[PDB]
Amino acid sequence: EMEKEFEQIDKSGSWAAIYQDIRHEASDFPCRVAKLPKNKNRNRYRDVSPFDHSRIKLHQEDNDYINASLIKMEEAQRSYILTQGPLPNTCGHFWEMVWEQKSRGVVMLNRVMEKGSLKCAQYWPQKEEKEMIFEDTNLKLTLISEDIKSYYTVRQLELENLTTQETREILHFHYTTWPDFGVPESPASFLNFLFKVRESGSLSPEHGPVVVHCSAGIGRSGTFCLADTCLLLMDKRKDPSSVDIKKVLLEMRKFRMGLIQTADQLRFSYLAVIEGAKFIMGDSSVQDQWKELSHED
Ligand SMILES: CNC(=O)N(c1cccc(-c2sc(C(=O)O)c(OCC(=O)O)c2Br)c1)C1CCCCC1
Ligand SMILES: [Cl-]
Ligand SMILES: [Cl-]
Ligand SMILES: [Cl-]
Ligand SMILES: [Cl-]
Ligand SMILES: [Cl-]
Ligand SMILES: [Cl-]
Ligand SMILES: [Mg+2]
């Protein structure tokens, strides 16, 4: 049981060993396509690639490659697309993916600039009157509105397929205070944000998989998805004790390498799930508590 295991690991201060164990046992699959010479400039990091078997393929004949993985959690019955922060030359591909995969939500866990460096291209319009057109993929993207909170922002976007003139609303959830290689300020601020994403309907099985990204699309993205999936599993069974966090993380790592980057992010995952379990099992007060503790106002 997660709560007992957590306290046991904390008492012996062996989170490093636990996390390293996961790295040791993690799946290893080929990333041949990602490593093709013609795709070098489509990758933000040399050492972070999507496995061939689970990679998202763009629906084009030229080059179908994007650094993005489909994490399909069979048991939980929810899927995520984890991807790197788009590059100046892959913003068109990013939005093509969103369109083709029928995603309704995009979760961004990083800032464009972190620690003096550019972790992600400016891939969405910052102003209503200045829409973006991606000529290579024939898509238009307009900022419709934004709801700015203290540590996160929610944007409404309109994505248009210029070829068919079909239009779709995309919800953009931007967590701006989650440090790279770090953890959220508190389980409360994290859960508050996760529930914002959930309550938008972006995770519904009626839509395509939500798109989740940070810079590399494995550390913070992995942490976010592990917590959500664990809460879902627990929800479906209404039994918190039935969820094996490490086993779920290992399952997720079958679909993309390196999910969750530090031992403390793993530890934080436990915190988030243990606290979130209160809502799952019928506590009607914790949701407001989190909102207050998060100081989103
Ligand atoms: C020490 N690094 C490491 O062991 N690796 C790795 C390799 C290349 C980039 C990254 C980055 S750079 C970055 C950022 O945002 O600057 C980020 O994100 C952190 C977060 O999101 O917390 C991550 Br991961 C990590 C691994 C070796 C290969 C397999 C997995 C990665
Ligand atoms: Cl496959
Ligand atoms: Cl504006
Ligand atoms: Cl303006
Ligand atoms: Cl303005
Ligand atoms: Cl204005
Ligand atoms: Cl304006
Ligand atoms: Mg304005």
Side-chain angles (χ1 to χ4, degrees), residues 60-274:
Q60 46 164 299
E61 291 168 311
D62 188 45
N63 187 346
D64 73 5
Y65 177 81
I66 179 168
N67 194 320
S69 307
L70 186 277
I71 285 61
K72 179 150 64 171
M73 305 304 289
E74 184 179 9
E75 181 173 37
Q77 299 182 303
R78 179 167 295 170
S79 294
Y80 316 84
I81 294 175
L82 273 58
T83 190
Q84 74 188 9
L87 295 157
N89 61 320
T90 71
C91 291
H93 307 145
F94 177 88
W95 288 112
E96 171 182 8
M97 174 175 70
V98 164
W99 183 270
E100 289 164 2
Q101 304 302 315
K102 298 179 162 58
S103 307
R104 172 87 203 297
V106 171
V107 177
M108 176 169 184
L109 300 172
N110 70 109
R111 282 172 300 143
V112 163
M113 179 177 291
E114 299 181 334
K115 293 176 163 48
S117 76
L118 292 161
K119 298 294 198 66
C120 183
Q122 187 56 54
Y123 67 89
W124 76 96
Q126 294 168 289
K127 282 170 177 178
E128 285 85 341
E129 68 274 18
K130 278 178 166 312
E131 77 275 12
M132 298 174 70
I133 290 183
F134 308 98
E135 283 182 325
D136 60 331
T137 52
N138 213 30
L139 271 24
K140 179 159 81 172
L141 179 64
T142 303
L143 177 64
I144 296 302
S145 69
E146 48 182 331
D147 185 18
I148 304 175
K149 301 292 181 174
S150 66
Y151 72 98
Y152 74 90
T153 295
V154 176
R155 301 184 183 85
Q156 289 181 210
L157 274 21
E158 177 169 308
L159 199 193
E160 181 180 349
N161 185 337
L162 268 26
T163 300
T164 64
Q165 288 204 322
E166 183 181 335
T167 283
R168 292 182 190 165
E169 176 171 80
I170 308 299
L171 273 32
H172 194 248
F173 303 88
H174 191 184
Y175 205 128
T176 60
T177 58
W178 191 338
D180 57 287
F181 295 95
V183 295
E185 171 175 305
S186 59
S189 64
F190 170 85
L191 288 169
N192 183 59
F193 178 84
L194 172 55
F195 274 57
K196 195 74 185 189
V197 177
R198 290 182 153 212
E199 298 198 327
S200 73
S202 300
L203 304 185
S204 177
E206 293 306 298
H207 299 125
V210 64
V211 174
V212 181
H213 84 87
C214 36
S215 192
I218 62 177
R220 289 168 286 187
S221 296
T223 301
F224 179 87
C225 293
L226 178 60
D228 182 59
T229 288
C230 285
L231 287 169
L232 214 208
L233 265 333
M234 174 185 311
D235 204 6
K236 180 67 171 160
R237 309 154 175 172
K238 288 299 183 305
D239 181 8
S241 285
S242 74
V243 55
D244 186 340
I245 302 188
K246 298 184 300 172
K247 204 190 75 173
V248 170
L249 180 52
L250 282 170
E251 176 66 27
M252 288 179 56
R253 279 193 175 212
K254 294 179 182 179
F255 300 94
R256 183 167 179 89
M257 64 173 62
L259 302 185
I260 298 195
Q261 173 62 28
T262 75
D264 200 40
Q265 288 180 340
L266 172 67
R267 178 180 188 271
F268 180 90
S269 296
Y270 275 74
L271 258 27
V273 174
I274 288 165

